[PDB]
Design an enzyme around this catalytic site. Structure first.
Site, short mmCIF file in Angstrom:
data_model
loop_
_atom_site.label_atom_id
_atom_site.label_comp_id
_atom_site.label_asym_id
_atom_site.label_seq_id
_atom_site.Cartn_x
_atom_site.Cartn_y
_atom_site.Cartn_z
N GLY A 1 31.35 38.39 33.30
CA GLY A 1 32.63 37.98 32.70
C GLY A 1 33.82 38.07 33.63
N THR A 2 34.98 37.61 33.14
CA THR A 2 36.22 37.58 33.93
C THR A 2 36.77 38.99 34.11
OG1 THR A 2 37.75 37.29 32.04
CG2 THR A 2 36.84 35.27 33.04
N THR A 3 37.66 39.15 35.09
CA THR A 3 38.22 40.46 35.42
C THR A 3 39.29 40.85 34.41
OG1 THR A 3 37.89 39.94 37.77
CG2 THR A 3 39.16 41.94 37.25
#
Ligand SMILES: [Cl-]
Ligand SMILES: [Mg+2]
Lengths: 250, 229, 111, 231, 241, 235, 243, 240, 244
Positions: G29-31
């Site tokens: 997933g995204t940060t």
């Protein structure tokens, strides 16, 4: 969530074996030796206190348990399974008997109730059998002194004397030679101690042996006077000293 | 089914040209005992609504917590919670109206009469009533309990129909409300001198006035009255 | 004891003409000897060229009208935007009312 | 492979294969387009027939006066989810006298789809939805995937060959967003967008389905000779 | 080979999931020790904060179950907290029902009986934790009772848990072989904590700073954990003799 | 094993796709819709000559204005018919009117995907639902175990379906009379049936606005078979 | 083998492989990050712009619980929403019974026990999210991070998702260089920088920055989104630092 | 509760549990039904692997559902008892609500419905039983004979057989039963039923059971000697 | 989920057999033989205890022969614990019937009920069947003396003489050889013991390895007595019939 294991985990194999029961009996075989001997005026049940560490206090772990004032129990196999059975056995002695008939159940019937609990773990959904064999000793007015074995399957048999667990095969042979129908309780205790010495490797004394009797009524242990018909419990757990006294006359 | 225990008396209210006014005294009565002298019975919701509540105080405090929770819930996953998707008076009323009728229909009512006063998104005045039975009605003036019998007559002399609303200024409206509160203090045995008044205006927003008192009272004529005949 | 019912008074009148129909009702809402409102609408347009009023206890009236309006909505969803005929509306309302046979909607209804 | 037997099982690389297989059902489905301006929001859907004797499967469902969706994938699942949307729209109106926000409708759909992806016995929904609606913050377009992911967009397309329409809308973005107060021109742009996903077949009178919602326009569906104007 | 996935018997009469839960016990790589004084029970445990981004005050494997009972856990934190919350709920319910404070050994039995159920019922997994309960019981005095994933429990004179439990156990065994008594013959708890820390240093062969340890102490009518500065005072006293 | 509601890698439900294979093994049923009425016809397919063929009930009345024909595991259809009949009658009780053919079909199709681990598996039967209402006139629907229903001008289901559907492709036009449709069903049934077609191993039925849903007598069908043979010998 | 096919099964190591696989979804997933400041907390997240068609500022990822707690997560977005919905129920019941708003450590354990409960049975799947959350209570500011296993700790700074190593390093610098503490306004700027720096691991597509904060002085202890001028100031500060 | 879907579709469109229930029926002892002009006869095989049996008390193969309808079966014996009980209860329930006994078709439809329900309910297996239901409708003299099977399909038969070697006895009936003229008397129908079983049975001794049902609740089971006379007369005509 | 571990105890094989029923029957075939023989003036129940020990308390023991009411008794072959579950159910059904009709339960009604219970475990519930076969010996005023058997399938049948457990093939041949219809109880006693004596896997048949019971109208006048034989009484009947 929900318990979605609504199906049996113990089933019949092609050969007619109930695998999970057989494997429970194997777990019992690995367990520490315990025994029972029936005399004319009493019963004795005994076992080794195999202490897991010397830092542990083995007095706190009770292998020999009171079920009713006149009934006691000992095991071989998985300790935790034994503990929860003792809790269920005590409660069922009240709920399905004392609260109805105003008296404690006779030995055979309590045994039957415990047997039923173990049978249901053999057939009910999402459970394994109990990994223990019990030896239950007790007295009641109309049947006298009696000794029963209970296995993982729920099957139970009455014995004059027997043993279960590790060195049961050798111990049962030892008991066959010694047992007769004219034994007094002290003679049975003496034989129990002799028999148990064979299966014990290390220390053999009152602190490494747990031994209890079903014998005479103990009014000193009752806790109250003033009712002539209440004469006290027949179950008594022998002290560490009392065991060591009989080990000198061994 | 219950019986009310600690109770609040009249809530009175009216519409004027740019908004609505609502008022209610600060008493919690315990039968004929005037037990609690500092009870706030107007409860604001956002900056556009005030809910005035009479009747059982424990049931009021429950409704108070329901409104508090309604604000929290509306804010969840709502980037426009303080703008286009803020709580309207009409939303707040309809919620309460639903609850009150559901509660009566289980034979376990919230023992209250409630007036929701506010101003809508488009500037429209909102004023509506609901009670323990779930009965609802709207009118240029609204009042609960004794206020219905005594305040309404006086308030209706100012705003008798819909067409009188644009003709009524906030100064005229507030005066009328304050006089009505005095009249109720003279004549309602379960009232108090202290009260709260709220104005919700479409231009100037929510003005909440605490610790007001009934003043300019006529008692001097009492001295001349002697005996019963 | 708690009494779940009440009387909000009012009076309503339905007349069926040859090619038209009127449903009239006063706008006064009351309890006992007090006027609650001088203008509280009691007759409602319910869609599909049907007008309705449920006179008596105004909370049960409002509840019933609200449920019928909703019944008209779901009739459109479930049956391909079919127009609900007046006879079909009538039978639907019977079932709404009889649904509370043992805790009645305390209203005299006309459509 | 060994980790696609049910929805309760992550793969070693952290994937949910049952959800991915449900995503695949959408790709098999017929193309549908969504787009909006500031005043109006449009759905355009290519309906699919079984053969020349059959009818063309309906792709657009109304949820309220101010909201509705188009589907692509399992049509019975779209009936379940649209029925749920209708109820939530209805609950908002009855309880709060409030039209349900399009964004909040998306959130509710997301949460409903999610429960089916974490529990044993169930299965994910096998459909993708394009929800349009006009509420208190103007026009809106949403894209729903049965994984749970709901996304607010200016325009999009889902189904087979949808990539062609989606590139067109990406180019046309600055033009169609400005089409305010002109429903006919916004639909034209949607019809031209869906045309970029056609092969062999073309837009006929019983093939095309269009729906619109806007400022003073209830959610209405146009089929049959009502869309001959746009062919 | 599904007899290794759920709690059913293998052909040898073994429960592999119980055995593997025991292995999960040492996943934290933390060692704990408990000892009894005259008037107190002391439990110490290693504290390791590997990340600098962690708030070190929130890193704990010691839990205050009731006013009288403390619990230290060897095993992963999610299961540790699962056990803790339950033990707190059970201790509170006991007091409400029976009118007196739950004894240490009785709670241990209760948690052990719960653990046993996970070994017999298939749908529930065992918790991969070893729970060491400590108190100064009003009847039995200073108490140490320890529970494991098999559902076994027993009272102890002293005990140790973790990867290097055997070294600590033998160190303690040897001390009690000399003294010939069941406890640390010391008046103040402060000195019993000093004994515990000293004998852990000897057994493990490592030195400790104030942030490398975590200490709990049971006395009559209360259990409490020591702050970093309370431990520092303890370490100073050890070094000065 | 594997879940009952599992998706295949292609994005289809295994159990639904397998039920469609069971329907291919079923006896043929054909429907043809016209502006004068809808005709429903079935292959009876008796497993033995001792089986009394008139007890084979593969065409069934739902309401006076709606009929139904089945193909596949015909035992599975009984509960579907029951539901359809209940829905038709229940709607009449609530609304004092006949129920729309589409709404009835949709009510039946809502059952289809109610399976899992509700019933244990999908239905193993497809249905041709034929009826009339005032809004959309004479209609024919094909209800599958997938929960999908398509309206058809004409449709064949069962073992002879793809061969029959190709024949219906050529033969159907919008100006067909009821008599023409009756002969057309008989013609195509005769083409795809293993055994030779007669009044005892095939059945006809129709639904008209005036008379409603009627299963044809064996005597009536026998005359339409004789009429067919002569008109095929006529060129 | 077969120990990884079912949730709640211990391998011979003593590991639950299904939980470890859930971690892989989080890592994909995204940060997202969290920064504890002097009198509050700051949350920030990387939102990947898949297409020009995404409406800017509309697809909000950070969620509020009660009025004083912020939650942000990386991994499967629906799983995070399901966890926040549970969090809101927990915080509502706590306030209902005990009057006061739920303390952050209390709230942390409520989420922690719930996620842990999804590692006890084979009939449920573990959470496919690491959640970073916190806020301001009576005892001051708190920042937590919660993994798929149910493990959570208190943090000075936290980070998860694809660019977590990059972010962690930046957070470690801030901890060393500011032992006295960081201001709320400073933390917002630094949060913007760290997301921009962590965007090198997701460099293919451009992104949108989203920031929120609770602070005793700056927001009265309530959760609020960083908007308008204050957001743009933090973007400009971040853009200046990468060049 | 146990919810496991035991009856499910296979790739080729078959429900194996239903098909394997038919294999249990194939294993069961042969049963045969033959309707005459004013009667129906149910014949049943008794395997002679079991002697030392007590035939007074052993469950008989033919069961009365009401005074006017009977049920025989092939397949699992324990399973049949469950269908018979439900049928008997439904027969009395029909009398109590409609004030009229069940038609044979209605009773069949009910039993067939129960068998079907077990092929798409969770946690249950289908019945390993096919039935022959026979009798006369109230105030009606037309004979009725129906057959059911595990799948839940039912249908009416002029004559039918089920169970082991039922292929052989169906072969016999297909050539020996004329529809235009069925067995005109009780004697002819019983004879044709005994003859059809003698193709399969082995010894005609205690291996054949016969039950005759006539209109207006007139049901009687034939004894050993009565049947034995039919066996005698058949083989004496055969020696030619 | 949980499906992975489900044995599916209630399914047909491709051949149309119930796996678990068949495998339970295999289990029972290794149990101690139990025999029932019905005479005109009574019923005999004999049964062999499995490889006993000298230390087993025999006079208080009961693994084979159980009393259901004053008129009905059963001989058990298979898992003793499983049998006791079913026995306590049957004892209740008999007393339920007594309470309702104020008459003792007919033997077949009791047997059907128990057999229907066993059937249920084969068709639904997903549990293993009971690994038990029963021989029912009983009397009522409708049919007189009756012998039945039931097995894990839930099928039951009536008998003149029957065996269950081990060596039933051999046992049934020997009974089929020496049984006659006009036989009496004292003869049937002798047949049952002779049959066990030949079919036993033990070296010799002795009193301590047997359980024995009779249901006689040998009860003063028009009533029925159940006699569960004591160890000494089994020893006496073994000497009388000439086996020891
Ligand atoms: Cl417990
Ligand atoms: Mg387990």
């Amino acid at each position: 969530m929900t318990d979605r294991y609504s199906f049996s985990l113990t089933t019949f194999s092609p050969s007619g074996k109930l695998g999970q029961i057989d494997y429970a009996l194997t777990a019992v075989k690995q367990g520490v030796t315990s025994l029972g001997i029936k005399a004319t005026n009493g019963v004795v049940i005994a076992t080794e206190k195999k202490s897991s560490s010397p830092l542990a206090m083995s007095e706190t772990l009770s292998k020999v348990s009171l079920l009713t004032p006149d009934i006691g129990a000992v095991y071989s196999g998985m300790g935790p399974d034994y503990r929860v059975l003792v809790d269920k056995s005590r409660k069922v002695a009240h709920t399905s008997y004392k609260r109805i008939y105003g008296e404690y159940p006779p030995t055979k019937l309590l045994v039957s109730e415990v047997a039923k609990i173990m049978q249901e773990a053999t057939q009910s959904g999402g459970v394994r059998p109990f990994g223990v064999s019990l030896l239950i000793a007790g007295h009641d007015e109309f049947n006298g002194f009696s000794l029963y074995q209970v296995d993982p399957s729920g099957s139970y048999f009455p014995w004059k004397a027997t043993a279960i667990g590790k060195g049961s095969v050798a111990a049962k042979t030892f008991l066959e030679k010694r047992w007769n129908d004219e034994l007094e309780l002290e003679d049975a205790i003496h034989i129990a101690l002799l028999t148990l010495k064979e299966s014990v490797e290390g220390e053999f004394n009152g602190d490494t042996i747990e031994l209890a009797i079903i014998g005479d009524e103990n009014p000193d242990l009752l806790g109250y006077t003033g009712i002539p018909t209440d004469k006290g419990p027949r179950f008594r757990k022998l002290t560490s000293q009392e065991i060591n006294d009989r080990l000198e006359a061994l | 089914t219950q019986q009310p225990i600690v109770t609040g008396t009249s809530v009175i209210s009216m519409k004027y040209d740019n908004g609505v006014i609502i008022a209610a005294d600060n008493l919690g009565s315990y039968g004929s005992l005037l037990r609690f002298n500092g009870v706030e019975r107007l409860i604001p919701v956002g900056d556009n609504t005030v809910v005035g509540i009479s009747g059982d105080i424990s049931d009021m405090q429950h409704i108070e917590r329901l409104l508090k929770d309604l604000v929290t819930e509306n804010a969840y996953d709502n980037p426009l919670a303080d703008a286009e998707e803020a709580l309207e008076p009409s939303y707040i009323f309809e919620y309460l109206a639903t609850v009150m009728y559901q509660r009566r229909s289980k034979m376990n009512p919230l023992w209250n009469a409630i007036i929701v006063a506010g101003v809508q998104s488009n500037g429209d005045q909102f004023l509506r009533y609901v009670n323990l039975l779930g009965v609802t009605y709207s009118s240029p003036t609204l009042a609960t309990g004794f206020g219905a019998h005594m305040a309404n007559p006086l308030l209706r002399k100012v705003v008798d129909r819909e067409s009188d609303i644009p003709k009524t200024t906030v100064q005229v409206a507030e005066e009328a409300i304050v006089n009505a509160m005095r009249v109720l203090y003279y004549r309602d045995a379960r009232s108090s001198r202290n009260f709260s008044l709220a104005i919700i205006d479409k231009n100037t927003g929510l003005t909440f006035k605490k610790n007001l008192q009934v003043e300019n009272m006529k008692w001097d004529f009492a001295k001349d009255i002697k005996g019963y005949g | 004891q708690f009494n779940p019912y009440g009387d909000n008074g009012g009076t309503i009148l339905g007349i069926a003409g040859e090619d038209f129909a009127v449903l009239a009702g006063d706008t006064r809402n009351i309890t006992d000897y007090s006027i609650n409102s001088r203008y509280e609408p009691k007759v409602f347009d319910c869609g599909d060229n049907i007008v309705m009023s449920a006179n008596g206890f105004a909370a049960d009236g409002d509840a019933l009208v609200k449920r019928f309006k909703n019944s008209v909505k779901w009739y459109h969803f479930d049956h391909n935007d079919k127009k609900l005929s007046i006879n079909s509306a009538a039978r639907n309302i019977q079932h709404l009312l009889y649904g509370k046979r043992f805790f009645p909607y305390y209203v005299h209804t006309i459509i | 492979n060994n980790y696609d037997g049910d929805t309760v099982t992550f793969s070693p690389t952290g994937r949910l294969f049952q959800v991915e297989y449900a995503l695949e059902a959408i790709k098999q489905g017929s193309v549908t387009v969504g787009l909006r301006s500031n005043t109006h929001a449009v759905l355009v859907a290519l309906k699919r027939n079984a053969d020349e004797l059959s009818s063309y499967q309906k792709k657009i469902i109304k949820c309220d006066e101010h909201m509705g969706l188009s589907l692509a994938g399992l049509a019975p699942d779209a009936r379940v989810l649209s029925n749920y949307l209708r109820q939530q729209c209805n609950y908002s109106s009855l309880v709060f006298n409030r039209k349900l926000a399009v964004e909040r409708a998306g959130h509710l759909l997301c949460d409903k789809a999610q429960k089916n992806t974490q529990s044993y016995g169930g299965r994910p929904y096998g459909v993708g939805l394009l929800i349009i609606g006009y509420d208190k913050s103007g026009a809106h377009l949403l894209e729903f995937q049965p994984s749970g992911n709901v996304t607010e967009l200016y325009g999009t397309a889902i189904g087979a060959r949808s990539q062609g329409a989606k590139t067109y809308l990406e180019r046309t973005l600055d033009t169609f967003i400005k089409i305010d107060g002109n429903p006919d021109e916004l639909i034209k742009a949607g019809v031209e967008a869906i045309s970029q996903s056609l092969r062999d077949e073309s837009l006929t009178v019983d093939n095309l389905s269009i729906a619109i919602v806007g400022k003073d326009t209830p959610f209405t569906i146009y089929d049959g000779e009502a869309v001959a104007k746009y062919i | 080979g599904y007899d290794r996935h759920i709690t059913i018997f293998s052909p040898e009469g073994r429960l592999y999931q119980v055995e593997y839960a025991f292995k999960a016990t040492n996943q934290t790589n933390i060692n704990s020790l408990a000892v009894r004084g005259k008037d107190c029970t002391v439990v110490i445990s290693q504290k390791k904060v590997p990340d600098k981004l962690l708030d070190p005050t929130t890193v704990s494997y010691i839990f205050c179950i009731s006013r009288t009972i403390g619990m230290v856990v060897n095993g992963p934190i999610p299961d540790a907290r699962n056990a803790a919350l339950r033990a707190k709920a059970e201790a509170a319910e006991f007091r409400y029902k029976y009118g007196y404070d739950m004894p240490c050994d009785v709670l241990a039995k209760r948690m052990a009986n719960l653990s046993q159920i996970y070994t017999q019922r298939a749908y529930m997994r065992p918790l991969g934790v070893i729970l060491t309960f400590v108190s100064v019981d009003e009847e039995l005095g200073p108490s140490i009772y320890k529970t494991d994933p098999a559902g076994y429990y027993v009272g102890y004179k002293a005990t140790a848990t973790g990867p290097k439990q055997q070294e600590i156990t033998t160190n303690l065994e040897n001390h009690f072989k000399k003294s010939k008594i069941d406890h640390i013959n010391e008046e103040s708890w402060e000195k019993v904590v000093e004994f515990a820390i000293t004998h852990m240093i000897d057994a493990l062969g490592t030195e400790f700073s104030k942030n490398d340890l975590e200490v709990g102490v049971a006395t009559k009518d209360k259990f409490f954990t020591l702050s970093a500065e309370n431990i520092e005072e303890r370490l100073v006293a050890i070094a000065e003799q | 094993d594997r879940g009952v509601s599992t998706f295949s890698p292609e994005g289809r439900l295994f159990q639904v796709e397998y039920s469609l294979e069971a329907i291919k093994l079923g006896s043929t049923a054909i429907g043809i819709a016209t502006k004068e009425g809808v005709v429903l016809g079935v292959e009876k397919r008796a497993t033995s000559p001792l089986l009394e063929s008139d007890s084979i009930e593969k065409i069934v009345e739902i309401d006076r204005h709606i009929g139904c024909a089945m193909s596949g595991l015909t035992a599975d259809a009984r509960s579907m018919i029951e539901h359809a009949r209940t829905a038709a009658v229940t709607h009449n009780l609530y609304y004092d009117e006949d129920i729309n053919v589409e709404s009835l079909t949709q009510s039946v199709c809502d059952l289809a995907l109610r399976f899992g681990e509700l019933m244990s598996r999908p239905f193993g039967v497809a249905l041709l639902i034929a009826g009339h209402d005032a809004d959309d006139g004479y209609q024919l629907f094909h209800a599958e175990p997938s929960g999908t229903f398509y309206r058809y001008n004409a449709k064949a289901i069962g073992s002879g379906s793809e061969g029959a559907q190709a024949e219906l492709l050529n033969e159907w036009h919008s100006s067909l009379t009821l008599k023409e449709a009756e002969l057309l069903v008989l013609k195509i049934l005769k083409q795809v049936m293993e055994e030779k077609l007669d009044e005892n191993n095939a059945q006809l039925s129709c639904i008209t606005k005036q008379d409603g849903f009627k299963i044809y007598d064996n005597e009536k069908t026998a005359e339409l078979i004789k009429e067919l043979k002569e008109k095929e010998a006529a060129e | 083998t077969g120990y990884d096919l079912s949730n709640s099964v211990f391998s011979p190591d003593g590991r639950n492989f299904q939980v470890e696989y859930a971690v892989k979804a989080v890592e994909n997933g995204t940060t997202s990050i969290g920064i504890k400041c002097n009198d509050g907390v700051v949350f920030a997240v990387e939102k990947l712009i898949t297409s020009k068609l995404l409406v800017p500022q509309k697809n909000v990822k950070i969620q509020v619980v009660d009025r004083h707690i912020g939650c942000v997560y990386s991994g499967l977005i629906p799983d995070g929403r399901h966890l926040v919905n549970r969090g809101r129920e927990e915080a509502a019941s706590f306030k209902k019974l005990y009057k006061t708003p739920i303390p952050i450590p209390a709230f942390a354990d409520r989420l922690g026990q719930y996620v842990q409960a999804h590692t006890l049975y084979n009939s449920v799947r573990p959470f496919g999210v690491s959640t970073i959350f916190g806020g301001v209570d009576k005892n001051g500011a708190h920042l937590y991070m919660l993994e798929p296993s149910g493990s959570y700790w208190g943090y000075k700074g936290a980070a998860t998702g694809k660019g977590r190593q990059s972010a962690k390093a930046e957070l470690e610098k801030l901890v060393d260089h500011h032992p006295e503490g960081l201001s709320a306004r400073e933390a917002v700027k630094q949060a913007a920088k760290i997301i921009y720096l962590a965007h090198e691991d997701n460099k293919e597509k451009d992104f949108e920055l989203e920031i929120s904060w609770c602070s005793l002085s700056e927001t009265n202890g309530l959760h609020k989104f960083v908007k308008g001028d204050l957001l743009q100031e933090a973007i400009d500060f971040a853009q200046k630092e990468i060049n | 509760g146990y919810d496991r879907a035991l009856s499910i579709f296979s790739p080729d469109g078959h429900i194996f549990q239903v098909e394997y229930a038919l294999e249990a029926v194939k294993r069961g002892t042969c049963a045969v039904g033959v309707k005459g002009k004013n009667c129906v006869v149910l014949g049943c095989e008794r395997r002679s692997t079991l002697k030392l049996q007590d035939t007074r008390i052993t469950p008989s193969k033919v069961s009365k559902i009401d005074s006017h309808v009977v049920l025989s079966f092939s397949g699992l014996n324990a399973d049949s008892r469950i269908l018979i009980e439900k049928a008997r209860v439904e027969a009395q329930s029909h009398r109590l609500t409609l004030e009229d006994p069940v038609t044979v078709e209605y009773l069949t439809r009910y039993v067939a419905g129960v068998q079907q329900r077990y092929t798409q309910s969770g946690g249950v297996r289908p019945f390993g039983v096919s039935t022959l239901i026979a009798g006369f409708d109230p105030r009606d003299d037309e004979p009725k004979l129906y057959q059911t099977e595990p799948s839940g399909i039912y249908s009416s038969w002029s004559a039918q057989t089920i169970g082991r070697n039922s292929k052989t006895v169906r072969e016999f009936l297909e050539k020996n039963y004329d529809r235009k003229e069925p067995p005109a008397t009780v004697e002819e129908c019983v004879k044709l039923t005994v003859r059809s079983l003698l193709e399969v049975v082995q010894t005609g001794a205690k291996n054949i059971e016969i039950t005759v049902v006539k209109p207006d609740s007139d049901i009687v089971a034939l004894s050993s000697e009565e049947i034995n006379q039919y066996v005698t007369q058949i083989e004496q005509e055969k020696q030619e | 989920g949980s499906r992975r571990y489900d044995s599916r105890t209630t399914i047909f094989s491709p051949e149309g057999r119930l796996y678990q029923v068949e495998y339970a029957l295999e289990s029972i075939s290794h149990a101690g033989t139990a025999i029932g023989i019905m005479a005109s003036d009574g019923i005999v129940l004999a049964a062999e205890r499995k490889v006993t020990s000298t230390l087993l308390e025999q006079d208080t023991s009961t693994e084979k022969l159980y009393k259901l009411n004053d008129k009905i008794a059963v001989a058990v072959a298979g898992l003793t614990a499983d049998a006791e579950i079913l026995i306590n159910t049957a004892r209740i059904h008999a007393q339920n019937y007594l309470k309702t009709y104020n008459e003792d339960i007919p033997v077949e009604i009791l047997v059907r009920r128990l057999s229907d219970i066993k059937q249920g475990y084969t068709q639904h519930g997903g549990l293993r069947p009971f690994g038990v076969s029963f021989i029912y010996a009983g009397y009522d005023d409708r049919y007189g003396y009756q012998l039945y058997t039931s097995n894990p399938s839930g099928n039951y049948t009536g008998w003149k003489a029957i065996s269950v457990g081990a060596n039933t093939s051999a046992a049934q041949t020997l009974l089929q050889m020496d049984y006659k219809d006009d036989m009496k109880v004292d003869d049937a006693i002798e047949l049952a013991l002779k049959t066990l004596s030949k079919t036993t896997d033990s070296s010799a048949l002795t009193y301590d390895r047997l359980e024995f019971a009779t249901i006689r109208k040998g009860a003063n006048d028009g009533e029925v007595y159940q006699k569960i034989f004591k160890p000494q009484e089994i020893k006496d009947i073994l000497v009388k019939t000439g086996i020891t």
